[PDB]
Design a protein around this ligand. Sequence first.
Ligand SMILES: *[C@@H](C)[C@H]1/C(=C/c2[nH]c(/C=C3N=C(/C=C4\NC(=O)C(CC)=C4C)C(C)=C\3CCC(=O)O)c(CCC(=O)O)c2C)NC(=O)[C@@H]1C
Ligand SMILES: *[C@@H](C)[C@H]1/C(=C/c2[nH]c(/C=C3N=C(/C=C4\NC(=O)C(CC)=C4C)C(C)=C\3CCC(=O)O)c(CCC(=O)O)c2C)NC(=O)[C@@H]1C
Ligand SMILES: *[C@@H](C)[C@H]1/C(=C/c2[nH]c(/C=C3N=C(/C=C4\NC(=O)C(CC)=C4C)C(C)=C\3CCC(=O)O)c(CCC(=O)O)c2C)NC(=O)[C@@H]1C
Ligand SMILES: *[C@@H](C)[C@H]1/C(=C/c2[nH]c(/C=C3N=C(/C=C4\NC(=O)C(CC)=C4C)C(C)=C\3CCC(=O)O)c(CCC(=O)O)c2C)NC(=O)[C@@H]1C
Ligand SMILES: *[C@H](C)[C@H]1/C(=C/c2[nH]c(/C=C3N=C(/C=C4\NC(=O)C(CC)=C4C)C(C)=C\3CCC(=O)O)c(CCC(=O)O)c2C)NC(=O)[C@@H]1C
Ligand SMILES: *[C@H](C)[C@H]1/C(=C/c2[nH]c(/C=C3N=C(/C=C4\NC(=O)C(CC)=C4C)C(C)=C\3CCC(=O)O)c(CCC(=O)O)c2C)NC(=O)[C@@H]1C
Ligand SMILES: *[C@H](C)[C@H]1/C(=C/c2[nH]c(/C=C3N=C(/C=C4\NC(=O)C(CC)=C4C)C(C)=C\3CCC(=O)O)c(CCC(=O)O)c2C)NC(=O)[C@@H]1C
Ligand SMILES: *[C@H](C)[C@H]1/C(=C/c2[nH]c(/C=C3N=C(/C=C4\NC(=O)C(CC)=C4C)C(C)=C\3CCC(=O)O)c(CCC(=O)O)c2C)NC(=O)[C@@H]1C
Ligand SMILES: *[C@H](C)[C@H]1/C(=C/c2[nH]c(/C=C3N=C(/C=C4\NC(=O)C(CC)=C4C)C(C)=C\3CCC(=O)O)c(CCC(=O)O)c2C)NC(=O)[C@@H]1C
Ligand SMILES: *[C@H](C)[C@H]1/C(=C/c2[nH]c(/C=C3N=C(/C=C4\NC(=O)C(CC)=C4C)C(C)=C\3CCC(=O)O)c(CCC(=O)O)c2C)NC(=O)[C@@H]1C
Ligand SMILES: *[C@H](C)[C@H]1/C(=C/c2[nH]c(/C=C3N=C(/C=C4\NC(=O)C(CC)=C4C)C(C)=C\3CCC(=O)O)c(CCC(=O)O)c2C)NC(=O)[C@@H]1C
Ligand SMILES: *[C@H](C)[C@H]1/C(=C/c2[nH]c(/C=C3N=C(/C=C4\NC(=O)C(CC)=C4C)C(C)=C\3CCC(=O)O)c(CCC(=O)O)c2C)NC(=O)[C@@H]1C
Ligand SMILES: *[C@H](C)[C@H]1/C(=C/c2[nH]c(/C=C3N=C(/C=C4\NC(=O)C(CC)=C4C)C(C)=C\3CCC(=O)O)c(CCC(=O)O)c2C)NC(=O)[C@@H]1C
Ligand SMILES: *[C@H](C)[C@H]1/C(=C/c2[nH]c(/C=C3N=C(/C=C4\NC(=O)C(CC)=C4C)C(C)=C\3CCC(=O)O)c(CCC(=O)O)c2C)NC(=O)[C@@H]1C
Lengths: 172, 172, 172, 172, 266, 162, 162, 162
Amino acid sequence: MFDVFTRVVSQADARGEYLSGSQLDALSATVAEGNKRIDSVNRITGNASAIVSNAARALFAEQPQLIQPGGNAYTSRRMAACLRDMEIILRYVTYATFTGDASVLEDRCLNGLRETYVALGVPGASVAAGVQKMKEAALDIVNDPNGITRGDCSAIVAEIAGYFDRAAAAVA
Amino acid sequence: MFDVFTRVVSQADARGEYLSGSQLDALSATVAEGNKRIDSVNRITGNASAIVSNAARALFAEQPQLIQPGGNAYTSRRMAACLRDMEIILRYVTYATFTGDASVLEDRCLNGLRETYVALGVPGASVAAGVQKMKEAALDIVNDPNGITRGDCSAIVAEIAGYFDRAAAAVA
Amino acid sequence: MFDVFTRVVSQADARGEYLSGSQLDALSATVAEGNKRIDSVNRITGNASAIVSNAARALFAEQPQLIQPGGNAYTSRRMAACLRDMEIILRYVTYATFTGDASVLEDRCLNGLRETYVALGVPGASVAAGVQKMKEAALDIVNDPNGITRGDCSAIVAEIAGYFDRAAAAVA
Amino acid sequence: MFDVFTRVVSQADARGEYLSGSQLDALSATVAEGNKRIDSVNRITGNASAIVSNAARALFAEQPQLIQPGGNAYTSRRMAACLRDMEIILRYVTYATFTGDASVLEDRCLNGLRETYVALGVPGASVAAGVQKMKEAALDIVNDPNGITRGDCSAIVAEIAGYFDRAAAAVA
Amino acid sequence: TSLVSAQRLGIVAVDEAIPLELRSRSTEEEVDAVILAVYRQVLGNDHLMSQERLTSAESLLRGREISVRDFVRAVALSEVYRQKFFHSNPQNRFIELNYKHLLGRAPYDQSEIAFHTDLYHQGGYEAEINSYIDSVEYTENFGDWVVPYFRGFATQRNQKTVGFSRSFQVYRGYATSDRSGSRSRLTRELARNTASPVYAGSTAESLRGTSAGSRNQMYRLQVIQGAAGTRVRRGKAEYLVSYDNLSAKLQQINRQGDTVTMISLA
Amino acid sequence: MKTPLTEAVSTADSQGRFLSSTELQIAFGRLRQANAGLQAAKALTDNAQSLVNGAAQAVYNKFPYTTQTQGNNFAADQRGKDKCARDIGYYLRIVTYCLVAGGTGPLDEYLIAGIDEINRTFDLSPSWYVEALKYIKANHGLSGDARDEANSYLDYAINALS
Amino acid sequence: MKTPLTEAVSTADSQGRFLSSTELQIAFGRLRQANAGLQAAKALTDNAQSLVNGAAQAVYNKFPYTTQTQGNNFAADQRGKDKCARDIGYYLRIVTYCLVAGGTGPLDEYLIAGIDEINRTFDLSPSWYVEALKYIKANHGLSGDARDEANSYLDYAINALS
Amino acid sequence: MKTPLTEAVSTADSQGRFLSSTELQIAFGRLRQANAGLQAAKALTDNAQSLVNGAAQAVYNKFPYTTQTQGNNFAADQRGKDKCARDIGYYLRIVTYCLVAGGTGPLDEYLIAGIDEINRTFDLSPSWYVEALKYIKANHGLSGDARDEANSYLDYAINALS
Ligand SMILES: *[C@@H](C)[C@H]1/C(=C/c2[nH]c(/C=C3N=C(/C=C4\NC(=O)C(CC)=C4C)C(C)=C\3CCC(=O)O)c(CCC(=O)O)c2C)NC(=O)[C@@H]1C
Ligand SMILES: *[C@@H](C)[C@H]1/C(=C/c2[nH]c(/C=C3N=C(/C=C4\NC(=O)C(CC)=C4C)C(C)=C\3CCC(=O)O)c(CCC(=O)O)c2C)NC(=O)[C@@H]1C
Ligand SMILES: *[C@@H](C)[C@H]1/C(=C/c2[nH]c(/C=C3N=C(/C=C4\NC(=O)C(CC)=C4C)C(C)=C\3CCC(=O)O)c(CCC(=O)O)c2C)NC(=O)[C@@H]1C
Ligand SMILES: *[C@@H](C)[C@H]1/C(=C/c2[nH]c(/C=C3N=C(/C=C4\NC(=O)C(CC)=C4C)C(C)=C\3CCC(=O)O)c(CCC(=O)O)c2C)NC(=O)[C@@H]1C
Ligand SMILES: *[C@H](C)[C@H]1/C(=C/c2[nH]c(/C=C3N=C(/C=C4\NC(=O)C(CC)=C4C)C(C)=C\3CCC(=O)O)c(CCC(=O)O)c2C)NC(=O)[C@@H]1C
Ligand SMILES: *[C@H](C)[C@H]1/C(=C/c2[nH]c(/C=C3N=C(/C=C4\NC(=O)C(CC)=C4C)C(C)=C\3CCC(=O)O)c(CCC(=O)O)c2C)NC(=O)[C@@H]1C
Ligand SMILES: *[C@H](C)[C@H]1/C(=C/c2[nH]c(/C=C3N=C(/C=C4\NC(=O)C(CC)=C4C)C(C)=C\3CCC(=O)O)c(CCC(=O)O)c2C)NC(=O)[C@@H]1C
Ligand SMILES: *[C@H](C)[C@H]1/C(=C/c2[nH]c(/C=C3N=C(/C=C4\NC(=O)C(CC)=C4C)C(C)=C\3CCC(=O)O)c(CCC(=O)O)c2C)NC(=O)[C@@H]1C
Ligand SMILES: *[C@H](C)[C@H]1/C(=C/c2[nH]c(/C=C3N=C(/C=C4\NC(=O)C(CC)=C4C)C(C)=C\3CCC(=O)O)c(CCC(=O)O)c2C)NC(=O)[C@@H]1C
Ligand SMILES: *[C@H](C)[C@H]1/C(=C/c2[nH]c(/C=C3N=C(/C=C4\NC(=O)C(CC)=C4C)C(C)=C\3CCC(=O)O)c(CCC(=O)O)c2C)NC(=O)[C@@H]1C
Ligand SMILES: *[C@H](C)[C@H]1/C(=C/c2[nH]c(/C=C3N=C(/C=C4\NC(=O)C(CC)=C4C)C(C)=C\3CCC(=O)O)c(CCC(=O)O)c2C)NC(=O)[C@@H]1C
Ligand SMILES: *[C@H](C)[C@H]1/C(=C/c2[nH]c(/C=C3N=C(/C=C4\NC(=O)C(CC)=C4C)C(C)=C\3CCC(=O)O)c(CCC(=O)O)c2C)NC(=O)[C@@H]1C
Ligand SMILES: *[C@H](C)[C@H]1/C(=C/c2[nH]c(/C=C3N=C(/C=C4\NC(=O)C(CC)=C4C)C(C)=C\3CCC(=O)O)c(CCC(=O)O)c2C)NC(=O)[C@@H]1C
Ligand SMILES: *[C@H](C)[C@H]1/C(=C/c2[nH]c(/C=C3N=C(/C=C4\NC(=O)C(CC)=C4C)C(C)=C\3CCC(=O)O)c(CCC(=O)O)c2C)NC(=O)[C@@H]1C
């Protein structure tokens, strides 16, 4: 996988050139944002169970066919797997947030996921909807202004929202 | 894999026939060439490192784009992988020379190599060029009249050249 | 070793507890069975040689491989050892009956006996068979209603059967 | 494993010495016996099945206890194992004959074989008897003057006898 | 196992090992790490010379042409594996090495030995090696993408308890290897379906006090004894003797005709 | 197929090694043997019919019940006698391949692997074929190296069947 | 590509775990280092032409036969000097990547893996590059954390060559 | 220990087979070669001192810096000259083993396995030893099969170093 730094290095090497002064400055701006990135990873992580269970509850209420007998999330093993997938996706979203690059999410989570669901008969569109609900609760949790040094986290929130949107698109 | 002898056996068995007198005599003619065959394998093997290294230097001199940054032979791992591939091909050509049949080279080295290189982005045409340079040096080494019981090795040299050509044609 | 009384005592001391009325009453009932316990021990002991030799003779009759040349009970030395083991087991069974607790039989006789027999090639399953024969003969002797004050010894007879069964289970 | 040549090399290298002119001559003498050695290997190999089965038949005829019910070679699985062991021993003896060194026989076949048989209750003395029968039939096959370039094979025959003897010693 | 036991038994590092899986779109470093782990496991932690590496099989794995399980099998079938573990070993030692290297456990029963001796006699070396890697046990523990790892120190479904005790015979410590052939320490206990005490890590140690002689060392002799003198109470015995009395004890055991199964420092 | 040259390369390839002097000596060993093997092949081939016919009759003589008993597995009718001659012809022809190839490779690949199952399924006695193979050993008329190599393959088959 | 951030995720992913305080502390460790690393990369980059030419001459001085002996592997001609100058530039450029990445990942991926085979195949002495790297260590003019991290990568390359 | 005889048994043992004509042919290849191998070994042995001295001098000449430069890895002093002559003697002695054994086994096990790590750790150039081996090839005075085999081992070592 890449992180925000090695992404720049890898592109530089293919061209055989040192990082420009503006590329180093840009990475310095990334470093200046490091604490907010760490806080957002910590906040999502601390609430992971709630994020998953609430989004799942919201999804099944919005989409009752999923849990009716014969529905895809019916039976304990299928429900268990569905909850696991939500958590896996959330976990890899935080990985991408931690590293500052989507490569981990794409390579280790999303690659092949659409084909997996198509083969299994998992409704990918319902997965994307559950990812949207997780996205919503996660960003509210990250933006919660209480109990934390005050500042502007809009950039990190946008970056996180992108990773969620990436996940939702990969399945839907 | 087949050798020169079992190649004829397998064909004969497929027809349920004994080898003909013509076939046995052909095999007896191969036996007469055996010493030359062995010498040619020995000579190529004794010079394997130089054949590879000189062929590679000559290839990177003619095709400097391979060894510029972002080029396919750039970075140590790719350069080392490239040199390995050259030595592998030469190794399998000596196996084919030793057995007197192309199957070992084709079954193990060449079959699927084109497709593998295409997926990797390895330039198959440049590999063929390198195989050509190894072929030219290898044939000169076999033909060196010094230090060996003089004789006509034209037949064995033509066979060895054919094996190099198979290898070259299989990558490009 | 423990006897029926010290077994209860040891458990109570570990709990830091006086024996309860029920436990004392249970021991009182044990005391009431004492004469029948004593009689059973005396009856087995008085017939010990016959019990052992008859069981041994019956064993070798049913399992002639034991005494054929090369058999584990062949040669005077091994036959003698085998007869001794039968006597040893019967003796410790009578000890356990006398004390009313298996600890003597388990600690002094059965512990490690399977390990000894496997290590030395003694056919444990045949020792078990002989023990079973000794069990049947001893119980007959204990249960004989002649020449003794009549009463119900089923509880002591059941306890004795348990000791033989332990012995048989331990060697195999 | 060592062969007759590498045996001498290994000893020489440990002493940091070139092979002495005496050692080279002794090896040259080994080479001069090469054709007899090959013939002895070929002859024993060509009769392997007869050698094993005849010796096995003779063994069981001489030692009926092996195949009586309860015997160590009774039941198809154990009889099959027994025939396998005979074949194995013969096979490694031919290996040692072929290499001119006992290392293959000792390392692959005999090392720990006594302990295996003792552990399992395989009568090692009977195995040794079986090996002896195979040895006698083998040496007669090797020494048969019919249909072979006449000469003195007494040295090779003695060496082979030594391998059979070592096997017979090892199992018991 | 937990720290309290693992520390005494010298298996803390085994307990904290994490299965290594080759993921989709792995980096060059991850492939390198996987190749290293396979060599350490399948070759029993020998020092691996660069001349011994499987150049081609490594390339194919790196190219995603073959799975991790294929690469494990390539190494197991290689001449390196053969020379290390097969050509100079008796069969039963070879088989327990295959169980350690390929399944990460010790053999459970004599019939496993019998099965694999028969298979070697029937189909040779390749058929023997393939039986481990193609087995249900291999596929369900490691599948195609996870490097094998030692399992014998953890409770496995459908294991025998004695698998745990036997693990200490084939796993001798982190800084050890299966390099010197030799005989199996398991032969007798497999053949007779028994177990042996675990003397590993610091469990071999016994108290010295003032009774351990001039060097303050005790040696633990494990013997199998019979009554061929005083009465013998157990067919299996242990003696603790100081260095100064060790020769006398051996001679005593020898004179009695009893068998020494193991000796070690205590 | 298992022959001196392919085994040499197979071993070398597994080690990722160029052929060395060890393999060259294997090639020389093959050359020493090849001409005698080719001569043995021609001699067996030329007398194939006589050998096959003779061998088939040898089996009938030693196992007369094969030509007297009715059954799919026996040669009491023309069908079985033709099966039998074919089979013996297979053994003979594949043995000549071994002489050409310089190893048991052809026997292993085409005849021996699976022969146990064939004989069991179709109730064919391997003792029949052993007798046919012995006849061929006794009548092929080879000598010297040609004889030694041919008999090794005939015995290899015989050992496989017993 | 080993770096603190990728190693943290790799470890957690192998365990199927969410990132915890342990991985958070790794990130803080990265942040504490990153600005000094970026400063070092700029300083090295701005002086690259001088460090590379100076390092190459240091190699030529220490090993004068490299500029006097004919051969493809030596730098007695302009072709070899250009190759040598290029190679040293690779080491310096890739070292600046390690400072950006905060780990040896770039050296491992781009340079170290396979360098033994290259030097062996083309008959290049690793001592030449050790001398070149030693020159850079003494002439990059860094201090503090930028010096310490930068020297670790130059030392890391040297230890790989020895 | 790659050798014709051990290879034949190793293969047969791996397959769980008796030796067959394939392995017998391998033995014949060995026998055809053995006397020449022993003769070469005798000739190299008798000339050991002159070959080693000559080879070391040929290296010192081709690489004069090795005699002029201080350092544990160079032959400026007697210590280094001793080590160097010792090393070249190892190469020669083990090559004689290969001729006796009939294969590269002795070079593989005693010398080549791990040589890369030694040369890198102690900063010894393979090119030095390559020159030594080239000299021995040019001056062992052997002919015929002895020349061919001995050169194959000398070239095997050379290729392993480059
Ligand atoms: C958007 C994400 C929200 C936000 C974040 C924010 N955080 C800081 C500063 C810090 N946060 C931490 C975090 C931790 N310290 C620890 O010991 C651990 C436990 C392992 C964690 C997670 C730290 C160390 C700092 C720096 C010190 C400080 O408290 O200031 C800031 C301030 C700016 C900065 O980049 O440091 C901000 C903005 N703030 C909001 O208002 C959002 C809701
Ligand atoms: C074309 C290949 C060149 C050529 C070859 C050539 N060789 C021979 C004859 C022999 N070569 C050998 C080889 C070896 N003997 C050994 O011991 C080893 C080392 C393991 C080797 C490689 C042998 C045994 C012979 C036969 C005896 C002899 O010394 O000649 C010939 C002659 C024809 C023949 O078939 O023998 C030839 C032609 N000759 C050339 O001119 C080409 C450059
Ligand atoms: C089952 C065991 C059988 C059985 C036993 C039984 N015995 C008694 C009573 C007594 N038995 C004795 C024993 C002895 N007195 C001695 O002097 C000796 C020698 C040391 C012995 C062994 C005694 C003293 C008594 C008590 C007095 C009496 O004679 O009765 C009973 C009666 C119940 C009781 O506990 O007293 C019983 C039941 N009776 C059977 O029918 C079983 C076959
Ligand atoms: C003791 C073993 C008996 C014996 C043997 C013996 N053999 C030879 C000579 C040869 N034997 C062979 C063998 C083969 N040639 C082949 O093609 C094959 C098949 C692969 C084999 C097994 C060969 C090649 C020779 C040399 C040529 C020849 O026919 O002479 C001798 C003679 C001495 C020698 O070393 O050559 C002897 C003595 N002889 C006996 O009397 C014993 C019963
Ligand atoms: C009744 C004894 C108590 C109770 C029940 C309760 N259950 C849920 C939610 C779920 N129940 C299940 C169970 C199953 N689903 C299956 O497919 C199967 C196997 C065939 C089982 C056993 C599941 C999966 C859920 C969650 C998803 C869903 O709602 O369908 C709830 C609501 C929980 C929530 O957060 O919505 C409740 C209330 N609750 C009590 O208090 C009763 C004593
Ligand atoms: C839940 C919101 C929805 C849902 C999910 C669902 N998924 C599966 C099964 C699988 N999911 C995956 C996905 C992954 N495995 C991984 O390792 C990773 C990458 C790290 C991912 C993303 C896989 C591979 C499977 C199949 C194997 C397995 O289940 O472990 C199921 C079960 C399908 C079945 O038939 O059993 C379900 C139910 N289903 C819904 O209805 C929701 C919309
Ligand atoms: C050198 C002249 C050219 C060159 C080569 C090059 N090849 C690769 C990668 C691979 N080559 C192979 C081929 C084989 N592997 C084997 O084991 C065998 C025998 C069966 C063969 C024929 C494979 C499988 C790979 C991929 C896996 C691996 O990297 O080892 C590379 C590396 C490419 C990359 O790392 O992305 C290179 C550079 N490249 C050139 O530019 C030359 C023309
Ligand atoms: C013959 C002179 C008289 C006789 C014999 C008789 N013996 C037994 C029983 C046994 N005999 C032995 C003896 C040995 N077993 C050994 O292993 C050895 C040492 C090698 C010897 C000497 C034994 C141990 C027994 C008992 C166990 C067994 O039956 O094998 C009997 C039967 C006794 C019984 O109760 O079954 C008899 C009849 N009897 C005469 O009247 C003869 C004059
Ligand atoms: C008879 C039914 C079977 C039989 C017996 C047999 N046992 C041994 C040897 C031993 N038996 C014991 C058992 C004990 N010794 C004790 O001191 C006690 C504790 C109170 C017990 C339970 C022991 C320790 C031994 C070994 C030492 C000794 O022999 O005294 C043998 C001899 C074994 C040998 O060959 O040495 C035999 C024959 N054998 C059978 O075949 C019957 C099934
Ligand atoms: C009877 C239908 C035909 C027949 C029989 C025959 N059998 C043998 C020899 C053996 N028979 C067996 C069989 C078994 N041994 C076992 O342990 C079991 C399983 C419990 C079986 C089925 C074995 C192993 C042998 C060989 C060893 C032995 O002799 O015990 C022979 C003699 C063969 C020989 O070469 O000595 C014979 C004659 N023969 C006929 O003609 C009948 C039609
Ligand atoms: C036959 C003459 C005698 C006999 C033999 C017998 N052996 C066993 C069991 C084993 N034999 C071996 C030996 C080897 N296996 C190998 O792979 C090799 C090296 C290539 C050797 C030397 C082994 C390992 C065993 C144990 C495993 C197995 O059972 O295969 C038995 C079976 C014992 C059992 O309890 O089943 C037998 C019968 N037995 C006799 O009675 C003859 C005297
Ligand atoms: C509970 C009453 C007592 C207790 C138990 C305890 N056991 C272990 C560890 C192991 N237990 C076993 C046993 C088995 N494994 C099997 O597969 C089988 C069936 C075939 C059995 C009987 C094993 C093998 C282990 C070790 C491996 C493992 O732990 O998985 C522990 C853990 C010890 C540690 O330090 O981890 C404990 C706690 N402990 C008590 O205090 C109770 C008296
Ligand atoms: C060098 C100062 C001394 C020396 C060393 C020597 N060691 C071995 C072999 C091994 N060394 C180890 C040690 C380890 N392996 C590990 O993984 C770990 C870390 C956890 C350690 C400490 C092992 C396991 C081996 C055996 C495996 C293998 O050799 O590959 C040798 C080789 C011996 C041989 O080739 O037989 C040597 C030479 N030897 C000396 O003379 C120095 C005093
Ligand atoms: C300089 C210290 C000395 C020197 C250098 C020299 N190098 C080469 C050839 C090569 N150098 C490399 C190195 C790399 N390639 C890479 O991709 C990387 C990683 C990013 C490195 C470090 C390689 C691979 C080659 C060979 C291929 C090529 O030609 O580029 C030469 C020429 C060697 C030849 O045979 O052509 C030279 C001269 N030479 C000296 O004398 C200096 C002391």
